[PDB]
Amino acid sequence: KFLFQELVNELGLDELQLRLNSSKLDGMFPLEGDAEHIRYSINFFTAIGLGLL
Amino acid sequence: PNEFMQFKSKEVEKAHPIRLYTRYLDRIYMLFHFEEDEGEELTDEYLAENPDPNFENSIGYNNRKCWPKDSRMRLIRQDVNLGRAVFWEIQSRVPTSLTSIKWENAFVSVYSKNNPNLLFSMCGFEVRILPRQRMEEVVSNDEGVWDLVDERTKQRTAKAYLKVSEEEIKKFDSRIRGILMASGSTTFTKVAAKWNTSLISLFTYFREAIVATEPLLDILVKGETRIQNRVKLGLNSKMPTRFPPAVFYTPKELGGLGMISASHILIPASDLSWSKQTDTGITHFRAGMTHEDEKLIPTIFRYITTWENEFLDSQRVWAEYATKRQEAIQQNRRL
Amino acid sequence: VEFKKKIYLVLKSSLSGDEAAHKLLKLKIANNLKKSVVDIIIKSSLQESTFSKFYSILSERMITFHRSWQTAYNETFEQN
Amino acid sequence: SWRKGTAFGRYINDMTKSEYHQEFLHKHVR
Amino acid sequence: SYNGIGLKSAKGSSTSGHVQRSLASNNRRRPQGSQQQRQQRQNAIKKASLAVQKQIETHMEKREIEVQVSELRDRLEEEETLSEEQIDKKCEALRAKLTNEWQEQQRM
RNA sequence: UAAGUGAUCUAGAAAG
Known part of the structure; x- marks a missing residue:
């Protein structure tokens, strides 16, 4: 959470999203559902100001 | 009442040129945010008032001598004129019998197309503010640099490099x-x-x-x-x-x-x-x-x-x- | 143990991170302990009240220097 | 428009009275 | 001092006045090569992207004809054509034959 | 196409 906060503060939100989009991001941003598992990641990222969840 | 440098609205904030102001102890810090039109007006009134054929007035300018040449305020005929004009205006605003607002004891910094850095001293600092958008390559933000944050986006919108003032x-x-x-x-x-x-x-x-x-x-x-x-x-x-x-x-x-x-x-x-x-x-x-x-x-x-x-x-x-x-x-x- | 102490001293004795980085590079530390050095640096960072630009700059410098240090930083991250 | 709203809108042979001297004193007192 | 970079002299300073080159200098020596991927990405992001031409074509065309004329001149001046009539006649022929061919071109 | 060569001031006696 702290790390992400730092990143956002430094780079920017949309920019950050773009950057991560370019990368793989398996554990952070899984696309293959895995049965109410994205819920978890999604939930956690709703805790901080993040979009696209 | 307002908090320190807050505004009830954006509109009110934007209405005047004089976007911020603070008198730390017999040393005022007026921040103006002119438009091209307004600036043109100011230069006009001043320049007409106090003419000069060449650039000329670039010499006898109170630059920040601690900073380096391409870091401190560049001497554009226009921007410099605006700065000087602004100072003149301010001087006119205060009556001389009340106090001495001599140019010699006044640093005027300018930010523009041709001037990317923005300088000042306060409480015995020297602070070179440089916005991220104007920087050619944002390196690993060094030490002795304040990354300033925009309140809306929460991004590191501008840097503020810090020297200690010569006086200090x-x-x-x-x-x-x-x-x-x-x-x-x-x-x-x-x-x-x-x-x-x-x-x-x-x-x-x-x-x-x-x-x-x-x-x-x-x-x-x-x-x-x-x-x-x-x-x-x-x-x-x-x-x-x-x-x-x-x-x-x-x-x-x-x-x-x-x-x-x-x-x-x-x-x-x-x-x-x-x-x-x-x-x-x-x-x-x-x-x-x-x-x-x-x-x-x-x-x-x-x-x-x-x-x-x-x-x-x-x-x-x-x-x-x-x-x-x-x-x-x-x-x-x-x- | 004493190596660690030395490293710490090198960090402290610098003004800004760059100086510290320079000092560390001068040390001539072999590929063996680079990871250990990085760990030490991290721990020192932790000891402080807050995150410092200093340490970040030092990290950057070292990273830039040689691929081995990049590797070390990575593996340290993994460890963390 | 904005510049209207203000209150004010539009040698001597004495070492103790030299312009240099007064200026100097101003400089070196605070 | 050394390479515009040593202390003026050790007297005053109140120190050795020993002058190391930093080893972050190698980082400042090659940050473009080290962080080439920073600009590379950016570049990639924007990496996808008549009258004059006509004029050029015209020049080529007229020029070709003029080359024909020149050739005529060559043939004449070299091989038995001391008179001016020969030259002029040749030129005329070139104009007629050339602009005929080029009229054909126009038609097509 | 991806490291580390090198610049190193002083310096103690008298009388106050």
């Missing part, structure tokens, strides 16, 4: 001199104590901003060595072998002096002829306060929380406090 450096030097003199009577411990006090004042006041100013570094080394020679002179010794850093930097508990090194720092000594023109990445490190059998005496600067960290941290902890206060209220308890 001079004051410090004077302090050191004072300490040195009236110390024939004074004993080593007392001398070192005074010096310690001086140093801690100098840092704890502007902590982060020491990194930049090479003159201040020089003063610290020079000053510190002078202090050491006060002891070493006192023993009529004044000699390297027989005063290893044990005697100085060891605390008063162990028969030492308690001197606080801001010395054994490596002084960043970049190419002096180039450095005057533009800021360089520090390339060559000079040896500051050296010694034979060099035990790496830690500085003091590493053990003081640099201001930016202190302030972000402050914001965090105070936020936390606020939140817990609310919790206490809800729970009806003494926090």
Whole structure:
């Protein structure tokens, strides 16, 4: 959470999203559902100001 | 009433040129945000009022002499004219019989198309604000740089590089001199104590901003060595072998002096002829306060929380406090 | 143990991070302990009240220097 | 428009009275 | 001093005045090569992207004809054509034959 | 197409 906060503060939100989009991001941003598992990641990222969840 | 530099709306904030203002102790800090039209008007009225055929007025301009050529305010015929014009306007605004607002004691910085940096001094700092969008390549934000944050987006929109003002450096030097003199009577411990006090004042006041100013570094080394020679002179010794850093930097508990090194720092000594023109990445490190059998005496600067960290941290902890206060209220308890 | 102490001293004795980085590079430390050095640096960072630009700059410098240090920083991250 | 709303809108042979001297004193007192 | 970079001199400074080159200098020496991927990405992001031509074509065309004329001149001046009539006649022929061919071109 | 060569001041006696 702290790390992400730092990143956002430094780079920017949309920019950050773009950057991560370019990368793989398996554990952070899984696309293959895995049965109410994205819920978890999604939930956690709703805790901080993040979009696209 | 408004909080410090807040506004009831955006519209009101935007209405006037004079977007911010503050009089720290007989030194006003008017920030104007002109449009091209307004600027043109100002230049017009001034220039017409006070003509000059050549550029001319670029000389006799109060630039920030501490900063480097391409860092400080560039001298564009237009921007400079605007600046001077602005100053003239301000002077007109205040009556002369009440106070002396002489140009000579006034620094005017300008930000524009042709001027990317934005300078000032305040509370004995020198602060070069440079927005991220204007920077050619945002390197790893160095130390002695405040990344400023935009309130809306929460992104690091602008940087603020920090030097210590020449005036403050001079004051410090004077302090050191004072300490040195009236110390024939004074004993080593007392001398070192005074010096310690001086140093801690100098840092704890502007902590982060020491990194930049090479003159201040020089003063610290020079000053510190002078202090050491006060002891070493006192023993009529004044000699390297027989005063290893044990005697100085060891605390008063162990028969030492308690001197606080801001010395054994490596002084960043970049190419002096180039450095005057533009800021360089520090390339060559000079040896500051050296010694034979060099035990790496830690500085003091590493053990003081640099201001930016202190302030972000402050914001965090105070936020936390606020939140817990609310919790206490809800729970009806003494926090 | 004493190596660690030395490293710590090198960190402290610098003014800004760059100086510290320079000092560390001068140390001539072999590929063996680079990871250990990085760990030490991290721990030192932790010891402080807050995150410092200093340490970040130092990290950057070292990283830039040689691929081995990049590797070390990575593996340290993994460890963390 | 904005510049209207203000209150004010539009050698001697004495070493103790030299322009240099007064200026100097101003400089070196605070 | 050394390479615009040493201390003016060790007297004053109150120190050795020893002058190391930093080893972050190698980082400042090659940050474009080290962080080439920073600009590379950016570049990639924007990496996808008549009258004059006509004029050029015209020049080529007229020029070709003029080359024919020149050739005629060559043939004449070299091989038995001391008179001016020969030259002029040749030119005329070139104009007629050339602009005939080029009229054909126009038609197509 | 991806490292580390190098610049190193002083310096103690008298009288006050």
